[PDB]
Amino acid sequence: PKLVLDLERLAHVPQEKAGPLQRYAATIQSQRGAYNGKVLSIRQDDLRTLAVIYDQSPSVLTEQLISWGVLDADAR
Amino acid sequence: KLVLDLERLAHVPQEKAGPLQRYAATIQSQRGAYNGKVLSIRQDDLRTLAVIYDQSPSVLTEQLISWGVLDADAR
Ligand SMILES: Nc1nc2c(ncn2[C@@H]2O[C@@H]3COP(=O)(O)O[C@H]4[C@@H](O)[C@H](n5cnc6c(=O)[nH]c(N)nc65)O[C@@H]4COP(=O)(O)O[C@H]3[C@H]2O)c(=O)[nH]1
Ligand SMILES: Nc1nc2c(ncn2[C@@H]2O[C@@H]3COP(=O)(O)O[C@H]4[C@@H](O)[C@H](n5cnc6c(=O)[nH]c(N)nc65)O[C@@H]4COP(=O)(O)O[C@H]3[C@H]2O)c(=O)[nH]1
Ligand SMILES: [Zn+2]
Ligand SMILES: [Zn+2]
């Protein structure tokens, strides 16, 4: 199970619900020195942290992220 | 940057290097990247390796540099 973000989709989700996630992906892009990408693969541990950021169980944050098309179905 | 020279690592006496070798090998397994000649690893892995080796992170680092496994920019 890789955790792949589609950042093109992510840039189309409105801000005050995608904001924390968008800032999270952006920092990961930054520290890697990779701003180029279609798509961002993130750590299993990032999902956990993001859940905390978003007041959700990893399971339902995943579900939310999958409905934006930000994560793919395979993410379960 | 914690970059391991795997090729130098393979030639270090296993008394010294086996644990780090197996560590590095596992990480390669997990990336499915079995063909690199260098491996950089997480900052976090240094703490774990310290425990594995029973030394300070900073001693371990000094040790790995002297084997020529780590380059000195990691000091
Ligand atoms: N302790 C340790 N474990 C390692 C290391 N390299 C790979 N792994 C482990 O093996 C899994 C697979 O890594 P991957 O194939 O590159 O799959 C990774 C990789 O594609 C990318 N990723 C995560 N962290 C980084 C990073 O710091 N830099 C880059 N360029 N990609 C990362 O996102 C993927 C998912 O990451 P994970 O959920 O963590 O799942 C990681 C991770 O648990 C390492 O250097 N140290
Ligand atoms: N293929 C692969 N390589 C790995 C992985 N984990 C660590 N590394 C490699 O080893 C470098 C050091 O990772 P770091 O200490 O965690 O230092 C990392 C880490 O602190 C952070 N970072 C990069 N990607 C991620 C990510 O996906 N999630 C999180 N939470 N932090 C990341 O930014 C720093 C810089 O990462 P890099 O520039 O890529 O530099 C990373 C990357 O080259 C992995 O799972 N797969
Ligand atoms: Zn657009
Ligand atoms: Zn608005």
Sole residue written with tokens 């990247």:
B33
| Gap sites in chain A (C to N > 2.5 Å), preceding residue numbers | none
* A42 CA closest ligand 1 atom index: 33
* A46 CA closest ligand 2 atom index: 30
- Find the A41 Cα to ligand 1 centroid distance in Å: 9
Verify whether ligand 1 is closer than 6 Å to residue B31 (CB atom).
yes
Sole residue written with tokens 């086996």:
B18
A58-67 and A44-53 helices cross at what angle (nearest 10)? 90
How many domains is chain B partitioned into structurally?
1
Phi, psi for residue B52 in degrees, rounded to 5: -60, -40
Host domain of residue A38: 1-76
Q: How many CA atoms lie within 13 A of B61 on its CB side?
A: 16
SS (H, E, C) A14-58: CHHHHHHHHHHHHHHHHHHCCCCCCEEEECHHHHHHHHHHCCCCH
B57-67 and B14-31 helices cross at what angle (nearest 10)? 100
Q: Residue A5 gets which letter from DSSP?
A: E
Sole residue written with tokens 């914690």:
B2
Resolution, expressed in angstroms to one decimal? 2.5
Verify whether ligand 1 is closer than 6 Å to residue A41 (CB atom).
yes
Look up the CATH number of the domain holding residue A21: 1.10.10.1930
